[PDB]
Amino acid sequence: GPSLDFALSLLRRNVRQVQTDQGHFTMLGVRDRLAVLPRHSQPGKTIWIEHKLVNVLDAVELVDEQGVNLELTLITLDTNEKFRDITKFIPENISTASDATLVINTEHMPSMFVPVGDVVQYGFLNLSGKPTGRTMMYNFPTKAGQCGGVVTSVGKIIGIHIGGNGRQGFCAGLKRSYFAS
Numbered sequence: 001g002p003s004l005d006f007a008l009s010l011l012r013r014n015v016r017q018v019q020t021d022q023g024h025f026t027m028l029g030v031r032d033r034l035a036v037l038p039r040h041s042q043p044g045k046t047i048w049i050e051h052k053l054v055n056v057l058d059a060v061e062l063v064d065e066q067g068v069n070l071e072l073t074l075i076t077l078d079t080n081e082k083f084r085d086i087t088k089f090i091p092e093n094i095s096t097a098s099d100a101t102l103v104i105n106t107e108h109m110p111s112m113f114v115p116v117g118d119v120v121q122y123g124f125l126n127l128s129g130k131p132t133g134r135t136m137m138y139n140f141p142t143k144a145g146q147c148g149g150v151v152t153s154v155g156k157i158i159g160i161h162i163g164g165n166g167r168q169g170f171c172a173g174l175k176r177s178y179f180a181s
């Protein structure tokens with residue numbers, strides 16, 4: 001319905017398949033040449049995007065005001081093309097949701113929509129040994145959720161999927177200010 005309408009349009013214009021030395025990832029293009037990945041993707045000076053070799057001009061691993069990992073990396077891409085600006089769909093404060101859909105798009109798992117349901121505040125999480133902040137939690141029963149993914153609800157882009165415990169999945173929450181200016 002309306003939730004999936006928004007998720008499909010987001011896929012089309014803003015969710016891309018990428019590959020780093022660490023594997024296959026879902027990338028969210030945010031605006032202009034700015035995109036976001038889960039930190040574990042560890043982008044290098046070049047990245048493969050939809051089968052094309054692209055230079056990474058800048059990469060920033062985001063931390064909070066204590067320097068605690070947020071498990072998000074912002075990259076600026078060496079390209080002329082511009083992503084549709086979706087920042088107005090990213091809430092000012094990290095937001096929970098009902099009836100959320102996780103959008104995964106990699107070469108090996110293309111255009112995959114997973115109903116996850118309720119997305120609940122969780123906060124501090126030790127993610128494979130790395131203390132992490134600002135997480136949310138949802139049902140996601142896989143041990144292979146290591147490719148990122150965009151958490152969406154009706155008209156809102158709320159998180160980047162970062163990992164899980166085989167029963168629940170966890171996202172880094174998105175706030176508009178991470179992408180400002």
Ligand SMILES: C=CC(=O)N(C)Cc1nc(C(F)(F)F)cs1
Binds near residue numbers: 114142145148
């Ligand atoms: C790293 C991509 C990812 O997230 N993987 C492989 C876990 C998932 N598996 C499914 C399936 F095929 F069981 F439905 C949906 S997401």
